[PDB]
Design a protein around this nucleic acid. Structure first.
Ligand code: MG
Ligand code: MG
Lengths: 618, 620, 623
RNA sequence: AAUCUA
C-alpha cells in the first residue's frame, strides 16, 4: 500500500486483496470512497486489426445520495468510461491488438469524494501492476477554482461552487495525455494556470504509483506478436507511393471525397505491388504499411512547407457560412456550414415538467439538468455516405453531445420559462462536427429568442510533430487551425475548445501521442482564441443579438380554472381524462392548486384544441 | 426545385442543399411540413444473397410533432407508427430495384419540420422516390404517392390531419409510370366496393402528376446512374440447362394433388438436391449461389406455367375455390373469448381478453404520446411463433405489420363505448399462407364468442396473381387471379393481395405487389374476385356462430365501486398509494380513484374480485 | 388422450390437435389450466461443438394470469419468473438427451389458459416430456414432474396457488423411469431434514405414475424416432490412443496437491497441447473437434479414477473435508453492511443496503410491477463479473445464470429474514474470485453481511455444494460405486456428475438445487448427499460464528433514517410545486424520497443522515 | 442468444 499526499487530500492505493484472478487489480481510496479497478487482457491476438480496448465504468446505486437502483448504462457512466479510455489508450504500445477490458467497481461511495477521478488512477495502477504492456503510469486529478483558489480533487460541495471543472491526466516527465474541462466562461490566463497546477499534482501521484510498482514485483508479459508494419516493407512502400501521394496532398482544389478517392486509387495501385514483392507478408500488414507511408508523407508537407492539403496556412479557417429561420414551424433553427461540415441545429421549447419523468429511481440515474438545458447530438450514417444502425445512441454521439452541451451551458440563461432542448444533426461531416454544433447551437438559440449572454464558437486545433526515435522527444511541431477530417486522422491530437469572445467554456483534448508538453497545450489555447474571434465575427453578421421575442408559433403556458364540483369529470378515473387529452394532443396539464390547473401548449393551435376540450368537459 | 399541383395541395421538391455527401438526397415540402430523405447504397456487393434494403423512418416528435421530448429518449427508440411507415416506404420502392442488385442500401427519412396539418408519411414516400431518382443508385422510374380520403362523399388528395379524422377511407396509393400500381394500403370504414374502386383510380391519376414533376427535376439535374460491379442473376444458359433437367420432375410434383405443405416442399427439395449437384459438374466455374437461384427460377417458371396453361392450382383447386375452412369456439373455459380458425394447413388461435380502460395508458406521458391511444379501446397483438413453420427462432417488424392489418380489418365493426378494453391475441400455430387474414376471421369469431356486439362478421382472404409478361415490352399479356393462395403460390406469385371486410363492404386492404407495377384493371378484378370468396367464408363462419352471445361469460371481468371514508383514506391508500399498489400487483385487480369518497375496482375474474373484496373489508 | 391420476389431481395429456407442424407437440391440462409445449429440432448439425438446447417458457399474463402482458412483451421483455421456469424445464430434460446430439433444439411453452388455481409451471415440464416423447427427436424415457408441498404437516402433490401460499416446502421433483431423480429444486421454510427427505420419496412415487401415463400415450400413437445424421462422440479407438499418451501426465497433475486453479488448468492445457499434435498426425482424417473432445474424455476419466480408487481429491483433502474458509465484516464505513467471504479461491463481496418500502414498487404499477414484488421486501442481486474468471465479457444486464444463482441464494436467506422490517433489505453479491461455488458462498457471505448490517436474522445460513463421481456399468448402465465430495472445486463440478447445492441453518434446510448431469440417479444417493452436506454445513457455520455470531445490536450510525415532517395545508402547493415537480426535483438532487401519507403529513426517507440534513434545509427554505 | 462458472 502507498499513500500519496495531494495538498489536503490523501490517495490510498493498495492491491493484492480483492479480485486476485485478474491480470491486474487495484483499490484506490480517498476518504471513505473506494474504487476497485480491474484490467484483463487476452493472450491470443484479436481478430480485429486494431486495439479492442473497452472501458466499462459501472456505478452501484448511481444517484445523488446513493439510491440503490437494482439495464442500461447511464450517461454519466458513459462519459466517465470515455475519460478513462482516453487517459490510458495513448500509453498502450503500438500493435497491441489484444482484447482488453478495464472494469470499475464502486466498492463504496461516501458522497463527498468523487469516484470518477479515483477510477482513472485505479486504471493506471491496475495496468501498472499487471503483466499487460503499458508505457508508464498516469496520474489524474481534478482542478477547480473556488473563490479564486485552485483546489485539487474538490469535494461534491466544492464542485457545486466551482467556476472550473477540469480533469488532467499526466504522464512521466510532466507530459499531458488527457484534458477534459468545462468552465463558467473564465479567463484564458486562469485556465492556463489551472493546467499547470494539475500537471504538477499528477507527478506526485505518478511517483507514488512508481513506489508501489517497485515494492511488488511486476514482470511484463511478452506478446507473441506486436502488429506493427515491418520497417523494411514500410520504406519500400515509401519508394512506390511517395511521389503520387505528394501530388495528391498538394492538389489544392480537392474536396473530401475527391481526395479520399485519389488516395484510394494509389492504395489499390500499390497494395497489389506490395503483395507480389512480399508474398509472405500479412494481408493486414500490407494495409497498415500504406497507412504509415501516407501519414508521414501527409505530415512532412505540413512540417517542411507550412502548407496544408487544402492550400491554407496553419492559422486560417475554412469557409464559414450560416443562416437562421430555415423553417416556419421550428421554434428555432440554424444551418451552420464550415468547409464541408454542415450541422442543422433546432431549438424546441418544452414544459419544465418534461425535464423530470416518472420512475423517480430512473430520474435520479440521469439526474436533472440544472438549467433545464440539454443538447441531443445525432450523427446519421448518411453524413459520411455510410450504412449504419440508427436505433439507440452511440458512445461517440453521447460524448459529442455532452461536449457541445457544456460549451453552451455557461451562456444559457437561468430560470427560463421553458425547458430548452437543442438538437444538432450532422448532415455533412468533415471534422469538428461537435464544435460546429456549438456555433450552430448558439445561432439557433439566438434565433429562437433565448437571451444568451454571448455567442459561443468552437474550434478544433490539430498538431503535427517531428519526434526523434532515439528518445521520443519533440523537436519541431505545427499547430493547425480548424482541422479537416484527414488532418485529425493523420494528426497527433484533436484539441476541441469552445468559448465566448471573452472566455473559455469547454475543452476536450483527445491526444493520440503518449504525452505532449504543456508548452504545446498553452500555444494551442492561444491559437484557438484568435480563430474563435474570426468565427464569432462571421457568426455575428448572420445574427448578433437574440430576437426580441420568441416565434409566434412557440409554446404558451396558461392556467385554467376548474371548479371543485367539475374536477372529477375533468381528471376522470385516476387521471384517465387528463392522460388521454395529453396523448391526442401535445398539451401537458399539471395540477397547481385544488381549483386551478396549469396547461402547457407546444403550439398555439394545440392550445385552441385543448381549450375546446376543456370547455366541453366543463 | 419543382412544384407539383395536386388539386388544392402543393408539393415542393428540391435538392442540392442538405446532405450533399449522400448518394441521393431530397427535401419534400407540403405546407410547412418538410421531410429530408437520403439514399445510400454501397459499392461492394453484400455478403448476403438477396437485396439488403432497409428503410428507417424516424420522427423527432410525437402527437403530430407536438412532443419535443420524443427523441431525447433513445430508449423506446422506435414506435409502431414509425415501423409501419417504414414498411410502407419499403413496399413502394423495393419492386423498382433491378433484379440481382445485392448491395446494402439504406433509405433514411428525417423530419425537418411538421406543422401538425400535413402528414409527413406520404411526403416521405415521395422523398424516397426523388432521392433514388436523383442519385446514381440503379432504380426504375419515379414513384408518386398520394393519400386518398372520402370526406362527405368527396375524394380528397393528401387530406390534412383534420380531414383524415373525418374520412371513411384512409388509402395510400403508390404509382409507377404508365399508371401502374406499386403499393396499395387502405383502411376503410366498411365502405362499398364501388366507392373503394373509384378512389384507387383517382389516386393513380394524381400519382402521375407527381411522376411528371419528379421527371422534370431529374431532367434539370445531370443525373448519371452508376454501373454496378455485378448484377447477381443466373446466367440464361444455366437456367435453360436446369430447365431440361428438372422441368419434368417438378411438373409431376406440382400436378400431384395429394401433397401437403411438408410433402410438397420435401419433394421439391429432393429434386433440388439431385439437380444442383449435376449443375456443378456442367458449370464448375459457376458462382455457388448462382446454382441455387437457377433452380429457383426454373421451379418458379414451371409452377406458374401450370396455372396459366391449365387453370389448375398445385393442390387441385381452380382459380376461385377456397381451401377447407373449419372453425371452433369456447374451447377453453377460463378465456373470455376464444376461437380456433383453420383454413387448409393454416391454423390460428384467437383469444379475446377484456382489460380495464386505464390499462391502455402508460404511467408516463412521453411513452403514452409516442405510442398513442387507439381510436377505440381495441388492439390486436399478432404472434408468429417459430414452431408454426417447424423452425427455431428468438422470441418483430413483420409481426407488427401483420397485427396492424388484422386490427384494421376488425376495427370498423368494433362497437363504441365498450366498458372494457378489448385485446385480441392471434397466435399462428400452423402457417401455410394468409395467417394475417385468418387472424381477422378467427378474431371475429372470438369477438362474437366473447359477447362483443360487433356490427358484422369480418372475413379476410388473400388473392394471388400469376402473369405472363413480354420480355421486351414489359407488358402483361395474360394473368390469373388466385383465391386463397397457399404459401408456395405467394412465393412463386406476383402479388399477395390481402383484403378483408364484411358481407357488405371492405374494411382493410394491403397489396404486396412484387412486380414493377400492375395495371389498374388487375387490381379491380382482384377486389371483385375477393368479394366472392369473402361471402363464402362468411357463410362457413356463420354456421359455427352467426351472432354475438347475449352476454359475456360468467368468468368475465366486472367493475364495481367501493366506498372509502375520508378517515380511512390514509390507511386504505397508504404512503403515496403504496397499499393500493401492493394490492393491484398481488390479486391482479385495478383500483382507480374517481372522486374523494369512492374507488373504482376492476377485477379480471369474479374470483379475483372476491380476493380483493375480502382484503379491502378488513382494512375498512 | 390419456388421464393420469395423482391423488386428488388429474393430468389430461393429448396431442395431434394444435400446432401439427412442430416435430413434437402436446397439451397438458390440470383443472382449467392448459399448456401447449412444442419441440423443434433441426436436422442439420449445429456449427457449434456442444448441445444448443434452448427452453423458452412464455406467459401471456401476470399475477396468476390476471393482467395481460403479451402486448407489452416487446418493451417489458422476459420476466424473472419466466426465466427461472425455463431453467427448471431445461434442467429436467437436458440430461436425457443422448450424448453427441449437437443439433439446435428449441422447446417453447405456450400458456393456452390459466385458471389462477393450477400452476402452469409444473405442467410445462410434463408437456416438454410428452412433446419430446411423441416427437421424432432422439430423447430418453419420459420424465414426470410434480410439486410437493407440506400444508399442516401433510404432503400435497401439485398444490394449488392457495395451498402453496400456506406451505412450508416448495419442492419440484423430476423423475425418470425406474425411480431415478433427474432434477431437484426446493425452497423450504427451515424445515427438518427428515421431513425434507420424505417429501422427495413421495414426489418420486408420483412422477412414476405420470411416466406410466405418458408411456401409454406414446405406445398408442406409434412414435418413430429419427436417425440423426451423426452423433458427435469421440471414436473408442481415438479415446484409447489418447489414454496411451496423456494418462501418466494427467495422473501426476491431479496428484500434485500444490496446484491452485490457474496452475492446475495451465498444467492440464500444457499436456493438451502436447497430445493434440500427436493425435493430429496419428489420425489426419479425424474431425478437429473429435480430437479436442477425445482429450476431454480421457482427462475426465483419469480425474475421476483417482477419486474412486484412492478416495483423495485433486487438492489432497478427503471426500468430506472443506477448503479453507475466511470471513470478514465491516470493510467499508459508508456501507450499511458488508462482508467478504472466502472459500478456497472463491471470493464473494456481499453488500447490504436499506431502502424505503416503496422502492419495491415499479413505475408501471398496473403492469410492470406485476412481474414481481418481494414478499418480505427482501431481494438478492447476484453478479458474476468477467474478471472473476480472468475473462472478458459484456457487462450490462443479467444473463440466465446470474438470475438463477441469485434466485437460489435469495431463497436460501429468505426463511431467516425477519418480518415487518422498517426498510427494504437489498443484498448484492459480487463474485470477485470464482472457483466453483459462488452462489452458495453468496448465502454465507450474505448471512454475515446481514448480521453486520444489524438485521436480526433468526439464524445464520450456510450453503455448500456436493459433487458426485460414479462408476457405471458400460452394458447395464447401473451405478455400482460412487463417492460424494464436499465443497467441490470448479474442476470437480466440471468433471463430476452432479452439482448438489443445498443451504440452511444449523437446524434445517432452506434451499436446494440439484444440477444432475447424469440421466437420473438413485434416491439413496440423494438421501446421503443431504446427510453429508449437513455435516459440512455445521463446520462452515462454526467458522462463520467466529467472525460474527449474532447480529449487531443496532444499525450503523450512517444508515438510513425515516421520519415525517408536517407540511401546512396553506403551503402544500408550494411544497409540492406544479404537479409534484418540486418533490421530484428534490428527490433527484438529494436522494431523499418524500411520500404523502396524510392531508398534512409527508414521510421523508433519507439514505444517510447527512443527506437528511440537505433535505431538511430544503424543506425549511421552501416552507 | 442458449449450455457452460470450465
Ligand atoms: Mg454447476
Ligand atoms: Mg450447473
Amino acid at each position: 500500500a502507498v499513500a500519496v499526499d495531494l495538498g489536503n487530500r490523501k490517495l490510498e492505493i493498495s492491491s493484492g486483496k480483492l479480485a486476485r484472478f485478474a491480470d491486474g487489480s487495484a483499490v484506490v481510496q480517498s476518504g471513505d470512497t473506494a474504487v476497485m479497478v480491474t484490467a484483463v487482457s487476452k493472450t491470443k491476438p484479436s481478430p480485429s486489426q486494431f486495439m479492442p480496448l473497452v472501458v466499462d465504468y459501472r456505478q452501484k446505486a448511481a444517484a445523488a445520495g446513493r439510491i440503490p437502483t437494482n439495464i442500461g448504462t447511464s450517461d454519466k457512466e458513459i462519459l466517465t468510461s470515455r475519460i478513462i479510455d482516453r487517459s490510458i489508450r495513448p500509453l498502450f504500445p503500438a500493435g497491441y491488438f489484444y482484447d482488453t477490458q478495464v472494469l470499475c467497481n464502486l466498492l463504496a461511495v461516501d458522497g463527498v469524494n468523487e469516484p470518477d477521478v479515483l477510477a482513472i488512477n485505479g486504471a493506471s495502477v491496475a495496468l501498472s501492476l499487471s503483466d499487460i504492456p503499458w508505457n508508464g503510469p498516469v496520474g489524474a486529478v481534478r482542478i477547480g477554482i473556488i473563490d479564486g483558489e485552485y483546489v485539487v480533487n474538490p469535494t461534491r460541495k466544492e464542485m457545486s461552487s466551482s467556476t472550473l471543472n477540469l480533469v488532467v491526466a499526466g504522464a512521466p516527465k510532466s507530459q499531458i495525455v488527457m484534458l477534459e474541462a468545462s468552465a463558467e466562461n473564465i479567463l484564458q490566463q486562469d485556465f492556463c494556470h489551472a493546467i499547470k497546477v494539475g500537471v504538477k499534482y499528477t507527478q506526485q501521484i505518478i511517483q507514488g504509483i512508481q513506489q508501489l510498482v517497485k515494492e511488488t514485483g511486476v514482470t511484463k508479459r511478452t506478446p507473441q506478436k506486436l502488429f506493427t508494419p515491418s520497417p523494411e516493407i514500410v520504406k519500400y512502400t515509401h519508394k512506390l507511393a511517395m511521389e503520387r501521394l505528394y501530388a495528391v496532398f498538394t492538389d489544392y482544389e480537392h474536396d473530401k471525397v475527391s481526395r479520399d478517392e485519389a488516395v484510394n486509387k494509389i492504395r489499390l495501385d500499390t497494395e497489389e505491388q506490395l503483395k507480389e514483392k512480399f508474398p509472405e507478408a500479412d494481408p493486414y500488414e500490407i494495409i497498415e504499411s500504406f497507412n504509415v507511408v501516407a501519414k508521414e508523407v501527409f505530415r512532412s508537407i505540413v512540417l517542411n512547407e507550412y502548407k496544408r492539403c487544402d492550400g491554407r496556412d496553419l492559422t486560417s479557417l475554412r469557409n464559414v457560412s450560416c443562416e437562421v429561420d430555415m423553417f416556419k414551424t421550428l421554434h428555432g433553427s440554424a444551418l451552420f456550414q464550415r468547409g464541408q461540415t454542415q450541422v442543422l441545429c433546432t431549438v424546441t421549447f418544452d414544459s419544465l415538467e418534461s425535464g423530470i419523468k416518472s420512475d423517480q429511481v430512473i430520474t435520479a440515474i440521469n439526474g436533472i439538468k440544472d438549467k433545464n438545458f440539454m443538447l441531443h447530438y445525432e450523427f446519421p450514417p448518411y453524413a459520411t455516405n455510410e450504412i449504419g444502425k440508427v436505433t439507440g445512441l452511440n458512445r461517440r454521439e453521447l460524448g459529442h453531445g455532452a461536449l457541445a452541451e457544456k460549451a453552451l451551458y455557461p451562456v444559457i440563461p437561468r430560470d427560463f420559462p421553458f425547458t430548452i432542448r437543442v438538437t444538432s444533426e450532422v448532415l455533412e461531416s468533415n471534422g469538428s462536427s461537435s464544435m460546429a454544433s456549438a456555433c450552430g447551437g448558439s445561432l439557433a438559440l439566438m434565433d429562437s429568442g433565448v437571451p444568451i449572454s454571448s455567442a459561443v464558437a468552437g474550434v478544433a486545433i490539430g498538431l503535427v510533430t517531428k519526434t526523434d526515435p532515439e528518445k521520443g522527444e519533440i523537436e519541431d511541431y505545427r499547430l493547425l487551425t480548424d482541422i479537416l477530417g484527414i488532418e485529425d486522422y493523420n494528426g497527433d491530437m484533436d484539441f476541441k475548445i469552445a468559448g465566448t469572445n471573452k472566455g473559455i467554456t469547454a475543452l476536450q483534448a483527445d491526444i493520440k501521442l503518449p504525452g505532449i508538453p504543456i508548452k504545446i497545450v498553452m500555444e494551442a489555447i492561444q491559437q484557438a482564441s484568435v480563430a474563435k474571434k474570426e468565427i464569432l465575427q462571421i457568426m455575428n453578421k448572420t445574427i448578433s443579438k437574440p430576437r426580441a421575442s420568441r416565434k409566434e408559433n412557440g409554446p404558451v403556458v396558461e392556467t385554467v380554472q376548474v371548479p371543485l364540483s367539475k374536477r372529477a369529470k375533468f381528471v376522470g378515473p385516476g387521471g384517465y381524462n387528463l392522460k388521454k387529452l395529453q396523448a391526442e394532443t401535445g398539451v401537458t396539464i399539471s395540477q397547481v392548486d385544488e381549483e386551478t390547473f396549469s396547461v402547457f401548449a407546444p403550439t398555439p393551435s394545440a392550445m385552441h384544441e385543448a381549450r375546446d376540450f376543456i370547455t366541453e368537459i366543463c
